[PDB]
Curated annotation (Swiss-Prot):
Monomer. Heterodimer with CEACAM6; heterodimerizes via its Ig-like V-type domain. Belongs to the immunoglobulin superfamily. CEA family. The chain holds residues 33 to 149 of 349 of the full protein. Glycans are attached at N79, N86, N90. This is Cell adhesion molecule CEACAM8. The N-terminus Ig-like V-type domain is necessary for heterophilic intercellular adhesion. Changing R53Q: Inhibits heterophilic cell adhesion. The lineage of its organism: Eukaryota, Metazoa, Chordata, Craniata, Vertebrata.
């Protein structure tokens, strides 16, 4: 799993796929992860606030604490990744992911995706509003 010698590195997140459809699943992978991630913490939006916290996992004690923005549809990974099942057009937006290190420190990386309504439009008339 090479990465790249030429050029600095920085924790990032790549959605996989990059654009799914309502009801589909999206796995947000991560790269340039820290040495020892004390615990991962995902959030809903562009802020690391509990009021928007989705789910947090602590490797130290291997504990899981779902936030208010939890719907029991997401799942964290040992690589600081989060799997979003049965996604929705609403989910689309921003997903901040902070990684805490044993050094009592933490990072920040906004990793989200886009969801498009991949469904047919059975209209007898034709031209409609929406």
């Amino acid at each position: 799993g090479s990465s790249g010698s030429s050029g600095t590195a920085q924790l990032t997140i790549e959605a996989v796929p990059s654009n799914a459809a309502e009801g589909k699943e999206v796995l947000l992978l991560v790269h340039n992860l820290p040495q020892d991630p004390r615990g991962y913490n995902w959030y809903k939006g562009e802020t690391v606030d509990a009021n928007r916290r989705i789910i947090g996992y602590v490797i130290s004690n291997q504990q899981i604490t779902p936030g208010p923005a939890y719907s029991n549809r997401e799942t964290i990974y040992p690589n600081a990744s989060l799997l979003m099942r049965n996604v929705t057009r609403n989910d689309t937006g921003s997903y901040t992911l902070q990684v805490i290190k044993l050094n009592l420190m933490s990072e920040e990386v906004t990793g989200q995706f886009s969801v498009h309504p991949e469904t047919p439009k059975p209209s007898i008339s034709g031209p409609s509003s929406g």
